[PDB]
Design a protein around this motif. Structure first.
Motif: not given
Ligand SMILES: [Zn+2]
Lengths: 116, 141
Positions: B5, B57, B76, B78
């Motif tokens: 990540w 995540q 956030n 990604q």
């Protein structure tokens, strides 16, 4: 542990066998945690400055070498979790590499970086 | 195979970020709230964001919670495809070798290609081979 983490960001190097990234004080006071019976870099500075060089780049926080992709790709899965490097340039002189083969330690070129 | 990540960081605080999160991990690996991270990648050629290794995540969000250096890119995270786990570790040609060719940044011989002769083990100064361009004290007063 708390001994494998560099205390200060100034004057830090990386070994050429396991790519241990530590401060110059830890390589003299304690030395290489992943190899102490074949290197013996604890208690002096000439041996620390001979094998371990400052010319290295890339930092990784190795924590679970038994289950991680980056550990296997760098062949550091049989080492202790800690600060490691991904490209440590240099080569050992012909004064300490001859004994490692007779003692059963295969010195591998940890420089995975490409040249030009 | 664990997933990778990307989190945003402050520009100029990459090594500080890494050395802080490693100490956080060592400081919470024995408590009831451990860290599910495997490793954090901080390339030297990048500037602005770093990489972290986790299976899902939620693990990164539950691990980077509370740090003031990763509070900005906290909303956030990604995800990169599986073929970008290899291009991160590639380094193109540390950068300290004798009998090499380096250039200066400050001084009078700016952007002039030079040569290295000897390296001081103290990591304080480095010898350089250049050619003087002064007038030998004839034009200047
Ligand atoms: Zn080593």
């Amino acid at each position: 542990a708390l001994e494998t983490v560099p205390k200060d960001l100034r004057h830090l190097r990386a070994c050429l066998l396991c790519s241990l990234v530590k401060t110059i004080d830890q390589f003299e006071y304690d030395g290489c945690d992943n190899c102490d019976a074949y290197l013996q870099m604890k208690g002096n500075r000439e041996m620390v400055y001979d094998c371990t060089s400052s010319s290295f780049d890339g930092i990784i926080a190795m924590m679970s070498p038994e289950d991680s992709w980056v550990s296997k790709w760098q062949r550091v899965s049989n080492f202790k979790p800690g600060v490691y490097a991904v490209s440590v340039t240099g080569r050992l002189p012909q004064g300490i590499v001859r004994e490692l083969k007779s003692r059963g330690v295969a010195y591998k070129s940890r420089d995975t970086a490409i040249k030009t | 195979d664990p997933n990778l990540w990307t989190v945003k960081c402050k520009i100029g605080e990459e090594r500080a970020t890494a050395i802080s999160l490693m100490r956080k991990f060592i400081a919470y690996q024995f408590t009831d709230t451990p860290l599910q991270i495997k490793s954090v990648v901080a390339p030297e050629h990048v500037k602005g964001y770093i990489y972290v290794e986790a299976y899902k995540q939620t693990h990164v969000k539950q691990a980077i919670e509370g740090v003031g250096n990763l509070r900005l890119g906290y909303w956030n995270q990604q995800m990169v495809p599986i073929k970008e786990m290899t291009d991160v570790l590639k380094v193109v040609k540390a950068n300290l070798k004798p009998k090499s060719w380096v250039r200066l940044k400050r001084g009078i011989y700016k952007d002039d290609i030079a040569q290295v002769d000897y390296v001081e083990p103290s990591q304080n100064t480095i010898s350089l081979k250049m050619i003087p361009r002064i007038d030998y004290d004839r034009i200047k007063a």
